[PDB]
């Protein structure tokens, strides 16, 4: 594996002090990219995904477009769930889909063995040594996956949901069940993570994009614990098989009331959304923990002057050091390329002019 | 307009002492009642609704079944949008919905004059008139009203959405035409809850239910100040009037980064959801407002008995003073109303033994 040339994303995700501030943008591998769509019809959204040299373009995709400081695979976080043995389907150009969710505690039976999951999804691994090999050293390479509960809630909900009901309901009428769905879940995410890093992975992103649905109570119960031991066992595993431990990142959208225990869960780096004010949160983490976000995607609509200046002022809040830019979810399918373009400018121009 | 028996909600709400907890829910009035689906039967949803005896009735009913301390009239936040000319569909039992949202700024010629809009609701004042005379006194009656900025995302989004794209994309793409929208909805709204007033509410609920979707700087630029005038005009218009002020709610969905400045909009009680905890609350807020919430509405998917914990752990939290109870949404279709017998009698019960 080449040797990494630009590396300001990791020293900052450390917490070591960097000339300038990185950036990248979750879904920077996205639709609002037009050669994205054109390489995206040459298949079934699954198996595309499925061919390593397909996930490698699309990863590489934007990096061609932008002086961007991470390159994250492109996935999707339903494979862990598919690779379980749950049937996606992918229902009239709406997305993700489970058309069998689970429902009773019986369900649970059709679930594979964790341990077995990291070998259905050899063609991830592929895809990320494929891709470390072609960035050819450019930047780091983020893996990722999405969080224990995360996950519950498109396993239990089916699709994507308002409320999280199904879910929840599941939480308060069914708590061992849910212990034991969560279980499986994290002794599946470990193996696939590590697997991602002997892969070739430098540094590994959990989503947990579904927190804003839990309060504090159930958040701590289901959440916090699952979330965790993904980190620790991951740690440990590396450390056993003679690997270096990446940065991990945990981005908990609309995780404001839990930020001081996910400083204290074991990552180096913790996400926020755009409503977290920066201030608020660098209280509620405290020094030694590096913070990534926050611009609200939406701004990207903006100007691109204006957009240079919600950029300043991000910046002014977060100050200097463990700071990773970034917008306060992923992209969206309608912005332009060109306003993306200016984000990403404005952070480096900024970040300079703000040092000297 | 007969004199008021039971008034702890309204002592409650201006922060004066109270020998218990007062509670009532968002959508207490919902389909989670089985006679409320028997009548809404009766006809198409928004001349159910346009019928004073129907709105009075679906008002009534939860009253029927628990010892509720206030009662909130039946009605749809999407009254307003479509009083200022937006025309409404029901779609395959799916809900609201405008076929034909605001897109370009030219759109906003479709709108009435504000105001006149007080006029086309004479429907829901005399639902107030009505219903004010059956509760006879028994509890306080409150109005309610959509906030500016959660209207202008229906009618802008048109349906439902994850993300308010549409919407936000105007906030940064046409502030000038966002500011125009919103303040012919403010301007609408004040004679709508002056209205409410006159016609014998006794307190009204401002929702903010897509507080949320805005960051601190959106929210105070877009959201804040439309919040506050609404308060300011409508405490006006009711003075000129003779009438005695009413407490006034707001309650931002999902606004914690909000709560400062909620505090000192000018409202008595705030609102608050779920995933605020109750202290970090009280602290945001300080000691002379009131607040209300905040119990996880799928809370009630658990048994009596784990409800009744629940509400102990957030009666401590929130303490004897300054305190209605209430969920942190409204009640979901599938609840089982013994449940929610359960949740009533469980703040009740505690609050009482709390004290004494």
């Given at each position: 594996?080449?040797?990494?040339?630009?590396?300001?994303?990791?020293?900052?995700?450390?917490?070591?002090?960097?000339?300038?501030?990185?950036?990248?943008?979750?879904?920077?591998?996205?639709?609002?990219?037009?050669?994205?769509?054109?390489?995206?019809?040459?298949?079934?959204?699954?198996?595309?995904?499925?061919?390593?040299?397909?996930?490698?373009?699309?990863?590489?995709?934007?990096?061609?477009?932008?002086?961007?400081?991470?390159?994250?695979?492109?996935?999707?976080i339903l494979?862990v769930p598919?690779?379980?043995?749950?049937?996606?389907?992918?229902?009239?150009?709406?997305?993700?889909?489970?058309?069998?969710?689970?429902?009773?505690?019986?369900?649970?039976?059709?679930?594979?063995?964790?341990?077995?999951?990291?070998?259905?999804?050899?063609?991830?691994?592929?895809?990320?040594?494929?891709?470390?090999?072609?960035?050819?050293?450019?930047?780091?390479?983020?893996?990722?996956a999405g969080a224990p509960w995360t996950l519950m809630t498109y396993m239990?909900?089916?699709?994507?949901?308002?409320?999280?009901?199904?879910?929840?309901?599941?939480?308060?009428?069914?708590?061992?069940?849910?212990?034991?769905?969560?279980?499986?879940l994290?002794?599946?995410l470990?193996?696939?993570?590590?697997?991602?890093?002997?892969?070739?992975?430098?540094?590994?992103?959990?989503?947990?994009?579904?927190?804003?649905?839990?309060?504090?109570?159930?958040?701590?119960?289901?959440?916090?614990?699952?979330?965790?031991?993904?980190?620790?066992?991951?740690?440990?595993?590396?450390?056993?098989?003679?690997?270096?431990?990446?940065?991990?990142?945990?981005?908990?959208?609309?995780?404001?009331?839990?930020?001081?225990?996910?400083?204290?869960?074991?990552?180096?780096?913790?996400?926020?959304?755009?409503?977290?004010?920066?201030?608020?949160?660098?209280?509620?983490?405290?020094?030694?923990?590096?913070?990534?976000?926050?611009?609200?995607?939406?701004?990207?609509?903006?100007?691109?002057?204006?957009?240079?200046?919600?950029?300043?002022?991000?910046?002014?809040?977060?100050?200097?050091?463990?700071?990773?830019?970034?917008?306060?979810?992923?992209?969206?399918?309608?912005?332009?390329?060109?306003?993306?373009?200016?984000?990403?400018?404005?952070?480096?121009?900024?970040?300079?002019?703000?040092?000297?």
């Amino acid at each position: 594996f080449p040797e990494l040339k630009n590396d300001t994303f990791l020293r900052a995700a450390w917490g070591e002090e960097t000339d300038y501030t990185p950036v990248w943008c979750m879904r920077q591998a996205g639709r609002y990219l037009p050669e994205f769509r054109e390489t995206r019809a040459a298949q079934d959204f699954f198996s595309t995904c499925r061919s390593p040299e397909a996930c490698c373009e699309l990863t590489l995709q934007p990096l061609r477009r932008f002086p961007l400081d991470a390159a994250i695979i492109f996935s999707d976080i339903l494979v862990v769930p598919q690779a379980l043995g749950m049937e996606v389907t992918m229902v009239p150009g709406k997305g993700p889909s489970f058309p069998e969710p689970l429902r009773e505690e019986q369900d649970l039976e059709r679930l594979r063995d964790p341990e077995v999951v990291a070998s259905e999804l050899g063609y991830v691994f592929q895809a990320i040594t494929l891709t470390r090999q072609r960035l050819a050293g450019r930047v780091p390479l983020i893996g990722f996956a999405g969080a224990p509960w995360t996950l519950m809630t498109y396993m239990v909900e089916g699709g994507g949901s308002s409320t999280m009901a199904q879910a929840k309901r599941w939480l308060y009428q069914r708590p061992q069940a849910s212990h034991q769905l969560l279980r499986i879940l994290t002794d599946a995410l470990v193996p696939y993570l590590v697997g991602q890093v002997v892969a070739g992975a430098q540094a590994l992103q959990l989503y947990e994009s579904h927190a804003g649905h839990l309060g504090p109570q159930l958040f701590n119960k289901f959440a916090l614990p699952y979330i965790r031991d993904v980190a620790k066992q991951v740690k440990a595993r590396l450390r056993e098989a003679g690997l270096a431990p990446v940065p991990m990142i945990i981005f908990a959208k609309d995780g404001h009331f839990a930020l001081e225990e996910l400083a204290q869960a074991g990552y180096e780096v913790v996400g926020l959304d755009w409503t977290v004010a920066p201030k608020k949160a660098r209280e509620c983490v405290g020094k030694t923990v590096t913070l990534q976000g926050n611009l609200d995607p939406c701004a990207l609509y903006a100007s691109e002057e204006e957009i240079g200046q919600l950029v300043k002022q991000m910046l002014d809040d977060f100050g200097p050091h463990r700071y990773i830019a970034n917008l306060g979810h992923g992209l969206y399918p309608d912005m332009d390329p060109e306003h993306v373009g200016a984000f990403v400018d404005a952070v480096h121009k900024h970040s300079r002019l703000l040092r000297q």
